[PDB]
Amino acid sequence: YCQHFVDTGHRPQNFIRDVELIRLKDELIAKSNTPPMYLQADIEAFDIRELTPKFDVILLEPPLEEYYRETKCWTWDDIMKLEIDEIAAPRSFIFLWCGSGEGLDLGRVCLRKWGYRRCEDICWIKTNKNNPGKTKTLDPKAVFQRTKEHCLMGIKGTVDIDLIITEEPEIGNIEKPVEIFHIIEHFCLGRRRLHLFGRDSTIRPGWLTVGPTLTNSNYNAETYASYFSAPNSYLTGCTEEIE
Amino acid sequence: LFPPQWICCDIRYLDVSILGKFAVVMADPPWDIPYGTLTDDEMRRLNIPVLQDDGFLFLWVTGRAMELGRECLNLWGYERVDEIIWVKTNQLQRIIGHWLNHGKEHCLVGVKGNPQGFNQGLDCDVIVAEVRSTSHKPDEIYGMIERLSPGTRKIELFGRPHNVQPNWITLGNQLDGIHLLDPDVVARFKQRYPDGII
Numbered sequence: 001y002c003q004h005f006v007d008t009g010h011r012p013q014n015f016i017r018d019v020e021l022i023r024l025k026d027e028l029i030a031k032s033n034t035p036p037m038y039l040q041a042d043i044e045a046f047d048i049r050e051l052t053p054k055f056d057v058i059l060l061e062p063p064l065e066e067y068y069r070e071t072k073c074w075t076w077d078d079i080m081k082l083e084i085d086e087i088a089a090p091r092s093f094i095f096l097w098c099g100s101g102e103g104l105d106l107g108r109v110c111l112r113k114w115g116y117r118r119c120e121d122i123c124w125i126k127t128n129k130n131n132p133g134k135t136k137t138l139d140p141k142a143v144f145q146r147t148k149e150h151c152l153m154g155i156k157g158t159v160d161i162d163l164i165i166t167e168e169p170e171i172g173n174i175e176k177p178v179e180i181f182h183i184i185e186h187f188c189l190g191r192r193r194l195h196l197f198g199r200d201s202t203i204r205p206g207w208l209t210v211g212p213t214l215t216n217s218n219y220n221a222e223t224y225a226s227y228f229s230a231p232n233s234y235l236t237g238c239t240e241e242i243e
Numbered sequence: 244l245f246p247p248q249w250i251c252c253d254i255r256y257l258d259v260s261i262l263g264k265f266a267v268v269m270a271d272p273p274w275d276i277p278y279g280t281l282t283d284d285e286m287r288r289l290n291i292p293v294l295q296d297d298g299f300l301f302l303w304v305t306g307r308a309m310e311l312g313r314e315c316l317n318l319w320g321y322e323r324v325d326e327i328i329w330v331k332t333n334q335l336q337r338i339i340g341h342w343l344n345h346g347k348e349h350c351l352v353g354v355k356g357n358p359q360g361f362n363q364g365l366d367c368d369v370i371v372a373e374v375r376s377t378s379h380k381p382d383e384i385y386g387m388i389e390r391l392s393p394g395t396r397k398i399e400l401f402g403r404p405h406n407v408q409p410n411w412i413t414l415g416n417q418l419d420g421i422h423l424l425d426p427d428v429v430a431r432f433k434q435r436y437p438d439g440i441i
């Protein structure tokens with residue numbers, strides 16, 4: 001469908017189709033979810049070690065300059081200087097949104113810097129079924145037209161597909177597909193889940209969201225910690241709650 | 244010589260300097276993760292750098308090789324400037340490490356030198372195509388590469404029979420003999436291998 005995209009403007013992925021009942025697991029995740037907590041903070045200027053306890057899952061969505069190639073951008077210089085390893089649990093996971101440029105390399109440097117190894121590369125494949133004749137300006141270094149973003153998965157220490165197909169968001173909208181949360185939550189990796197650089201629009205049960213653009217906070221380190229005091233400490237997120 | 248050429252050999256031991264310069268190198272190496280694999284050192288020491296001065300490298304990577312291939316790519320003198328993914332479907336156009344099921348294959352794109360005269364921006368970094376045979380790369384990449392670099396000299400490493408393509412010299416051990424037609428190349432091959440045996 002590549003001689004077709006060059007002809008009609010439809011990206012090869014505009015033609016993938018369909019884009020048993022695993023429903024009970026979803027019920028278990030939902031019953032298990034902590035209430036949402038959130039905290040406005042400027043992450044540049046904030047000691048991350050105050051975020052406690054240590055996290056089972058970190059979802060990290062820094063605002064790359066490339067997200068605003070049409071309309072405070074963080075550089076990979078800035079991202080790399082975060083001390084993620086200070087808030088990661090000894091056995092824990094990271095999901096890092098890397099964009100489609102240097103980030104696919106600088107994001108792997110970050111993963112290694114913080115003590116993870118990449119075991120999954122998740123691709124957000126963006127269709128243009130509603131604007132075929134809208135070819136985008138290219139990175140100077142780009143050979144091809146970039147129609148996807150990558151989200152790198154990292155593990156440290158000891159069902160689904162590695163693709164997300166949705167339609168390209170309207171220019172200036174930076175939201176990532178909410179399906180990233182389903183993939184994450186279906187792994188059953190722990191209940192202490194942190195989204196850095198989330199927004200009001202991303203707040204979600206079972207998640208602690210920290211980000212400079214939040215409008216309200218309800219963070220309390222002690223209240224948050226109580227959700228995981230025994231006998232709730234080592235639950236996966238996908239099990240019956242303890243009576 | 245537009246028509247397909249190939250050289251059955253061990254790429255570890257063939258002298259690739261005979262082959263000249265190319266505008267595009269493509270390799271689908273057997274990474275060490277059903278056939279003979281090269282260790283990481285054998286891969287780093289491949290003589291990619293003599294193959295190009297100004298041009299592009301297409302490097303299939305899977306698993307652990309997404310990190311090693313980035314290493315070899317930098318070691319050989321390239322900067323990674325794109326990454327193609329092939330979404331694998333069936334004849335009904337639906338989708339088909341140990342943590343997720345892999346519905347794609349990755350191809351790093353690297354640049355070297357100052358390649359000039361290339362129509363960059365004509366294709367997507369997503370290929371969609373039916374999975375032909377197990378461990379077969381999809382024909383659409385050749386078209387993509389042809390649109391990028393029309394009529395230039397190209398070389399594939401670790402090709403299999405069906406990989407032979409016009410404007411392409413394929414190297415690989417599952418090939419049949421030595422089919423060479425470009426006069427400058429049949430010349431350097433006879434000067435470097437008088438008795439025709441690597």
Ligand SMILES: CNc1cc(N2CCC3(CC2)CN(c2ccc(CN4CCC(C)(C)CC4)cc2)C(=O)N3)ncn1
Pocket residue numbers: 252253254255271272273274278279280281303304305348378379380381401402403414415416417
């Ligand atoms: C000892 N040194 C050598 C060796 C040598 N060959 C080595 C043996 C080969 C033929 C060439 C290689 N291969 C092979 C199989 C699978 C892959 C993985 N890939 C992932 C990307 C893809 C989906 C687009 C295609 C499949 C990649 C490759 C063979 O099945 N057979 N040629 C010269 N010297």
Ligand SMILES: [Mg+2]
Pocket residue numbers: 026182183186
């Ligand atoms: Mg779900």
